[PDB]
Amino acid sequence: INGSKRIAQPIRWAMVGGGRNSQIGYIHRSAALRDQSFALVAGAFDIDPGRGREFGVQLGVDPQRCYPDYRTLFEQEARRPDGIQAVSVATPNGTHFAITRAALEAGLHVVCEKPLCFTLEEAETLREIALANNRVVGVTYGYAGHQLIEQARAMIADGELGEIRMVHMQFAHGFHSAPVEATKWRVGPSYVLGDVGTHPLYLSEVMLPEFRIKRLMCSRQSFVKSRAPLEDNAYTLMEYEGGAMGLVWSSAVNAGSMHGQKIRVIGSRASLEWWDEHPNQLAFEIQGQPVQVLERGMGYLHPGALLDDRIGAGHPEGLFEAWSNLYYRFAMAMDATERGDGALLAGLRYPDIHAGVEGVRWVERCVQSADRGGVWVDY
Amino acid sequence: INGSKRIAQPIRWAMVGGGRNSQIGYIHRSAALRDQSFALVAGAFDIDPGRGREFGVQLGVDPQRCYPDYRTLFEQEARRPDGIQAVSVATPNGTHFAITRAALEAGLHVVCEKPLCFTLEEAETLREIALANNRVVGVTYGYAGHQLIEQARAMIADGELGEIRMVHMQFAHGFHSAPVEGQNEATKWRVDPRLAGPSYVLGDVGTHPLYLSEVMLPEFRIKRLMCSRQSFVKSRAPLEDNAYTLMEYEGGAMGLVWSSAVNAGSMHGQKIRVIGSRASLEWWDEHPNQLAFEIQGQPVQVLERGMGYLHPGALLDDRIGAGHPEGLFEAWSNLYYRFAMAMDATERGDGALLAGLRYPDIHAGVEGVRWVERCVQSADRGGVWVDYL
Amino acid sequence: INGSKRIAQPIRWAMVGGGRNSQIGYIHRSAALRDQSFALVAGAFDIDPGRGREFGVQLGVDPQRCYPDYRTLFEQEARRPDGIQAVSVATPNGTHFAITRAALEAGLHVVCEKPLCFTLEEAETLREIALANNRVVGVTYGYAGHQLIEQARAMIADGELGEIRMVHMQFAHGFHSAPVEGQNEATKWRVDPRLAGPSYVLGDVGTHPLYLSEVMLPEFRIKRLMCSRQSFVKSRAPLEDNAYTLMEYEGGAMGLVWSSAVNAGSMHGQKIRVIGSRASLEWWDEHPNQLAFEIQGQPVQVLERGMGYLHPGALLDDRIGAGHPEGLFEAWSNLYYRFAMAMDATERGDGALLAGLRYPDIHAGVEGVRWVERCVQSADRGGVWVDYL
Amino acid sequence: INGSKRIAQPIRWAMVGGGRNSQIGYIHRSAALRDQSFALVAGAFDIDPGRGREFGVQLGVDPQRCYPDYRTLFEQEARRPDGIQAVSVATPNGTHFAITRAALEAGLHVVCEKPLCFTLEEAETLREIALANNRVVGVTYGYAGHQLIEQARAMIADGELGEIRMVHMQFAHGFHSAPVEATKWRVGPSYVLGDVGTHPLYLSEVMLPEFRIKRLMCSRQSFVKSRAPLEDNAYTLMEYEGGAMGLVWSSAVNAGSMHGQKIRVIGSRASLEWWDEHPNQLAFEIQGQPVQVLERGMGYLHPGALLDDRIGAGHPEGLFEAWSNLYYRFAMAMDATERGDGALLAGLRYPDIHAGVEGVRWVERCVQSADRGGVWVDY
Numbered sequence A, D: 001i002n003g004s005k006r007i008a009q010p011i012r013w014a015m016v017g018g019g020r021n022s023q024i025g026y027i028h029r030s031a032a033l034r035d036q037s038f039a040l041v042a043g044a045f046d047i048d049p050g051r052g053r054e055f056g057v058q059l060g061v062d063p064q065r066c067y068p069d070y071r072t073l074f075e076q077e078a079r080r081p082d083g084i085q086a087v088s089v090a091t092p093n094g095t096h097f098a099i100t101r102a103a104l105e106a107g108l109h110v111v112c113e114k115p116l117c118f119t120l121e122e123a124e125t126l127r128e129i130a131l132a133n134n135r136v137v138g139v140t141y142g143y144a145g146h147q148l149i150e151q152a153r154a155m156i157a158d159g160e161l162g163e164i165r166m167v168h169m170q171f172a173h174g175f176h177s178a179p180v181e182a183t184k185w186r187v188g189p190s191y192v193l194g195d196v197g198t199h200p201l202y203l204s205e206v207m208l209p210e211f212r213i214k215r216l217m218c219s220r221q222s223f224v225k226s227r228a229p230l231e232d233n234a235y236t237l238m239e240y241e242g243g244a245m246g247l248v249w250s251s252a253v254n255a256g257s258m259h260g261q262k263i264r265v266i267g268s269r270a271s272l273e274w275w276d277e278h279p280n281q282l283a284f285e286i287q288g289q290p291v292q293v294l295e296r297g298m299g300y301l302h303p304g305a306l307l308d309d310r311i312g313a314g315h316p317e318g319l320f321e322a323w324s325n326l327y328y329r330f331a332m333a334m335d336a337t338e339r340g341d342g343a344l345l346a347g348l349r350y351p352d353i354h355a356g357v358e359g360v361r362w363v364e365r366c367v368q369s370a371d372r373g374g375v376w377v378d379y
Numbered sequence B, C: 001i002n003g004s005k006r007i008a009q010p011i012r013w014a015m016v017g018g019g020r021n022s023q024i025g026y027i028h029r030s031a032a033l034r035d036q037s038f039a040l041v042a043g044a045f046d047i048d049p050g051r052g053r054e055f056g057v058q059l060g061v062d063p064q065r066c067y068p069d070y071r072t073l074f075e076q077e078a079r080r081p082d083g084i085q086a087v088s089v090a091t092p093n094g095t096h097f098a099i100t101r102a103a104l105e106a107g108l109h110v111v112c113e114k115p116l117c118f119t120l121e122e123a124e125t126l127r128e129i130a131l132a133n134n135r136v137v138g139v140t141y142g143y144a145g146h147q148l149i150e151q152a153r154a155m156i157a158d159g160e161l162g163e164i165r166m167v168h169m170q171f172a173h174g175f176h177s178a179p180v181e182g183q184n185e186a187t188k189w190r191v192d193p194r195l196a197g198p199s200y201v202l203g204d205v206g207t208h209p210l211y212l213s214e215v216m217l218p219e220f221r222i223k224r225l226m227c228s229r230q231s232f233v234k235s236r237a238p239l240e241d242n243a244y245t246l247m248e249y250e251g252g253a254m255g256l257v258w259s260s261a262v263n264a265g266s267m268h269g270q271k272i273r274v275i276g277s278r279a280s281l282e283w284w285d286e287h288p289n290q291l292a293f294e295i296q297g298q299p300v301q302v303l304e305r306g307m308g309y310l311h312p313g314a315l316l317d318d319r320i321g322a323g324h325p326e327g328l329f330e331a332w333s334n335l336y337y338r339f340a341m342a343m344d345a346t347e348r349g350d351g352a353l354l355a356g357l358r359y360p361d362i363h364a365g366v367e368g369v370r371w372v373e374r375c376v377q378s379a380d381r382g383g384v385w386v387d388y389l
């Protein structure tokens, strides 16, 4: 990657949410504006119209296209020949469904934050409106943009681990060990299952695209009792079709842990393990051989895992590179749709409406199991 | 520790098992003989009397005290004024019960290998006989000898982690990812119910970090558990080479044990993480001289063996200054000197010394058997919650 | 940082070099374009005008502002009312002096790639011209943009390490262990004196952690140094692919720099350890979000980017909450926004803002050239002590 | 290793030093008594006769063979048919020469602590007395007993690193960062050069037996000024015959460092790196390939590196195992000498009189260079 243009002109783009004091607003813009993928021309940046406009102007947005709310954004932009083509939804979880639905009905492509929405019926309603209106829905499972996730997928498909036996996933941080705005709204049918567990779950779907969950059980806890019934800790044990096992540990009360997102795929011959805090390395551990570390950008990687390198091996890339790798694919997908290039659109892989639906499905089944005291449920 | 004797004379000692080709025989002797705790004066070292006697002679044992079997060992030693006072049992799991019972009935102290036996009923029988005969029974949960386990126990009791919320345990190695039992006698018996018992990895490796949790959290009581177990090498069924045990403690803390012999690429992977409201501790058997201590909101720390900031109890067993790596042989030596002090204290009827000593004993052995039995009951019922007691 | 503009309008910007196949061209643009600091409106991107123009068009540059060479770029842009205000120079080392001088004489601000130039005389000439023309000169010591470098500087100034005794620096990678310059244009020019200068690894990688030491210890002055340099790939002689620089600071602290491109197996290996009477700090470029902080007698600590326990100056540039990994692109973005603020402040004659800004500037570039020149003088005399000034 | 006897009966053994409060006394006994190599039958354990005897009795020694001093030990033991055959010298550095010389003249085999002695003339005097009296002198370069040091030697000899270019050694701990009995005497022509620098120097001699130092320079400092002229920090840069370079960083003022003994051997093709605090792993880093970690006890190791395994791979061995590996070789060497088995004696490798001499030579040359302001000197 050298900043060459992927599409003829940047997608005309807005955000809803991601305002001045938001945790995630900035990485959406840093990734979307990079390499001429998107141009930020409008937004409803803040729950408060006045702060949305002040912030919007500082981002270089036309003051008149800093709108009080998503409805006004979609209505007013529809009247302009240079109106937005796509919107990123970076609001709290409870508004994802309504905003995404409104954007799709207005004929806009959408990038929606995870978890996509609360219920599986909402998720499949967004999917059917997206399909009817021929719109791209991206979902910011940002960690999936790291090159070594593709390396892992390519190695598993090539049989380098032998027969897959176990998938061990965690996203277990300590930032909510204590009863500490962003946290207030998080504390919806779930907290950490949707907030963090869905991340390495989606990494498992990228690495093992043919794996199907047969049944699962989930035991969830509110260690900070005032969060009940929202869980700040959960254990999900899964049986895949064919007899492989999966385990997801979701947590916001793993005291001392800075992030702790890890995925270990264990085969008959070898394991791989990836850790989000050191995203440029992939452990590759053949039983009976010295353990190995695979590095981003090295010539021994599969060709697919080298495509998105922005600097030579040994220079650390980070999560902004991963997000940039998703956003250029989002832009290529939206552009392909506008030009009616069904061929390009068919060859692209990115976290899409189907990834969003599967994350919502998984949370729903975990909550069903957990509310019943951690019993097996059919997936 | 400077090699000073702990008891007036070494305990007169034998082994059953632990012969020439055994995996674990050597660490028993290396730990028992150290610092004048035990003297190896007899044994039945091998399933084959001939190989047992040839090996016994190489260990410096009198050829006439290399016996063909444990029955002969106990009978012939009873007829000597310098007869053994204690025996270590390092045979496959299926013989632990019979040998330990025979040794207790012959009036001997015992160090029995884990797992103690197959059934909770066997375990309670050995406990009754050990009590009736006033004998010490040690169990070689060897990892519990590492000083930083005592550091973790002292910190938790002192409230340094806040309120305990989770205990995450694994012992997940990759050595049996392939069907190596075809080629490897030690693996072979582990995958035969007649020889290994109701389980493979739950008893073989899961009980290790479980016992570390009992040392760190002595007042925790498991309320209920569930266990899902797999035979990834299908020929091992019904014995599991992988298992997940999820536990609810009284008080609402959660425990998780991952037991595995098919974690391909893992050299050992025994880890325990204790998670509290304020902080976490994490210990890893392959780097036993360090303890991760992670206070939420503060820089992570590593606590090092032998440093002046440790609790006094965690410094007692240091054999060399901080920074020099101790290993699993030091951990086993720390259990065996305690075994010797317990056995000597019993012979001298020193109830006071006996009360101050902490070592893996008959009760630790019984709890390990109880845990495996409950896991197997849950797993055989499709991994459903079962009452622990 | 939330993408808020730092200056009223983006600086009108070009590059010389950094074309389609370049190693470093992209990170310049990724950092400069971010957060509305610079706008890329022209360039001479390639040694080959045709490849420069085709690439320029893919970058969204007007085909008529893709110029064949730097002279044409400066001349033609001067004839436009929307002419460039600043240029980044990403060419091989041998052209830095001529291009930077030409840009300064054309009244342009400059971001010049390290090393600034070949000789200390060239460096002092660029400094004089930059001062006469009131122009900012940034130097892309990019690793200095990492927040935890500012954390280390703040801790040292606060006396958290005690009295500083040693500074241990390396940048020792293995990419040129084999003679890959046969095959690789970027390696090829680095091993030719005409193109690369008086040194290879001293200037190419040694100057990076050296500049980190100047950021962390701004009041340290090198008194004298010695340098032993080797050409392990003999065809590179007289340019070194390995070097040891030992330095005595005024005050009696010692510094060590290991510069290498033949550290086989090393992916980058840029590290700085600052050792004081009370504690040490250690930073490693491949894991830039952590800082080891090791107080003697206490548990080692790791300081994490974005945590509330950091000094306020080390939190200013956080673009995402603690635990999410930033990378070298964030470090470069942190230097480029400062470059833009410095250039804008100069144009508005805002002496006050200019005094508060810290970034690698003409003086950092001169000191890097001085250090290489002294090392080469020592090495050519068989690695003897030489006076630094 | 399964505790099988290497020699027909244990060597009759004494210590001088290594008493109740000594730092190193215990590991000598733990290693020497193991696997029936040595039997502790006498000693002069303490500078104070009374404390030597009290401690001696607690170690199981005949009270009458706990002697006030080394002269009395050697004289009285010579009168007994069951008299000592060998002595380990664990006293402060200044007494090594006199005690070792006396032991050799009394016809005893000796294990002497490093550094062997102060001067090269003393070292070559011990060598000539040892040779004249046909005695074994072992030197407790204990780290050399770790199996993966042999693995490194075997890999280098087999050309696995390509042509050797650089040897980077450190022993840099922080325990004397502050002006803190054992430390008092350490603070002799040197402190950290002899106390710690000689350790990884000897590892380089085991790994690269054919390497010869051509010239070196050493810059040494007294950061705790009251130690002057003894150095608590030193840098030694070395040129080997053939143009490889070596670097030794010796330190007791590396604040926060728990031990920091490391050796990295860098070849044209690959590097190896060993760290004493994690002695069961060896980094093996082929340029252009994933980095690897070699583990103690694994089947992929050279046969020589498996001989001393006392437990299966994955169980951590420590420095007591390394010392035990030196002491059984010391015992086999002494026994071979007594039986006049010149054949066995010739096949054994252990840190011996020659290792002791080379450590003393290296310290002398470093001190010569450092006293002259860190100038190159011929080796």
Ligand SMILES: NC(=O)C1=CN([C@@H]2O[C@H](COP(=O)(O)OP(=O)(O)OC[C@H]3O[C@@H](n4cnc5c(N)ncnc54)[C@H](O)[C@@H]3O)[C@@H](O)[C@H]2O)C=CC1
Pocket: A016, A017, A018, A019, A020, A021, A022, A023, A024, A025, A044, A045, A046, A047, A048, A069, A070, A090, A091, A092, A093, A095, A113, A114, A115, A140, A141, A142, A181, A182, A185, A195
């Ligand atoms: N993909 C990932 O890695 C991450 C995703 N997220 C997701 O991003 C979303 C936002 O999370 P945070 O940034 O942490 O929340 P936040 O609470 O930090 O910020 C929310 C922002 O949305 C604005 N806002 C709220 N309601 C609005 C409305 N109706 N219209 C317009 N603006 C509105 C607020 O003014 C604020 O600027 C959530 O869905 C969360 O799950 C958050 C962090 C990481």
Ligand SMILES: NC(=O)C1=CN([C@@H]2O[C@H](COP(=O)(O)OP(=O)(O)OC[C@H]3O[C@@H](n4cnc5c(N)ncnc54)[C@H](O)[C@@H]3O)[C@@H](O)[C@H]2O)C=CC1
Pocket: B016, B017, B018, B019, B020, B021, B022, B023, B024, B025, B044, B045, B046, B047, B048, B069, B070, B090, B091, B092, B093, B095, B113, B114, B115, B140, B141, B142, B185, B186, B189, B204
């Ligand atoms: N505490 C720990 O960390 C470990 C415990 N163990 C336990 O130690 C025991 C032995 O395990 P391994 O050494 O791996 O087995 P192994 O198969 O390697 O050795 C068994 C030994 O006992 C001998 N033996 C078998 N039956 C005998 C009998 N009836 N009488 C006398 N000798 C007999 C065999 O000849 C052999 O010497 C098992 O209970 C196992 O669970 C094993 C490894 C580690």
Ligand SMILES: NC(=O)C1=CN([C@@H]2O[C@H](COP(=O)(O)OP(=O)(O)OC[C@H]3O[C@@H](n4cnc5c(N)ncnc54)[C@H](O)[C@@H]3O)[C@@H](O)[C@H]2O)C=CC1
Pocket: C016, C017, C018, C019, C020, C021, C022, C023, C024, C025, C044, C045, C046, C047, C048, C069, C070, C090, C091, C092, C093, C095, C113, C114, C115, C140, C141, C142, C185, C186, C189, C204
């Ligand atoms: N700050 C840092 O971390 C790094 C700095 N650098 C520095 O950046 C500079 C470039 O290095 P690389 O990108 O590795 O070199 P490279 O060989 O990869 O690329 C050189 C580029 O400049 C172009 N070029 C050459 N001469 C030119 C001229 N007269 N006019 C216009 N374009 C010209 C070439 O066509 C090519 O696009 C060097 O000074 C190097 O020291 C390089 C890598 C990292």
Ligand SMILES: NC(=O)C1=CN([C@@H]2O[C@H](COP(=O)(O)OP(=O)(O)OC[C@H]3O[C@@H](n4cnc5c(N)ncnc54)[C@H](O)[C@@H]3O)[C@@H](O)[C@H]2O)C=CC1
Pocket: D016, D017, D018, D019, D020, D021, D022, D023, D024, D025, D044, D045, D046, D047, D048, D069, D070, D090, D091, D092, D093, D095, D113, D114, D115, D140, D141, D142, D181, D182, D185, D195
């Ligand atoms: N090989 C290795 O890894 C190590 C070697 N050493 C070396 O071991 C030797 C001793 O070091 P530490 O144990 O640290 O010293 P220390 O000061 O801790 O103990 C010295 C012991 O020798 C006794 N002693 C002193 N003079 C004596 C004499 N004339 N006769 C009999 N006993 C005497 C003292 O009573 C004391 O027991 C030194 O040469 C040191 O360099 C020390 C630590 C590690």
Ligand SMILES: O[C@H]1[C@H](O)[C@@H](O)[C@H](O)[C@@H](O)[C@H]1O
Pocket: B204, B205, B208
């Ligand atoms: O490999 C394991 C390990 O040695 C355990 O410590 C032991 O309990 C098991 O029996 C053995 O199979």
Ligand SMILES: O[C@H]1[C@H](O)[C@@H](O)[C@H](O)[C@@H](O)[C@H]1O
Pocket: C204, C205, C208
């Ligand atoms: O590989 C290195 C690295 O990118 C350094 O950051 C740079 O200064 C050098 O020029 C380059 O060769």
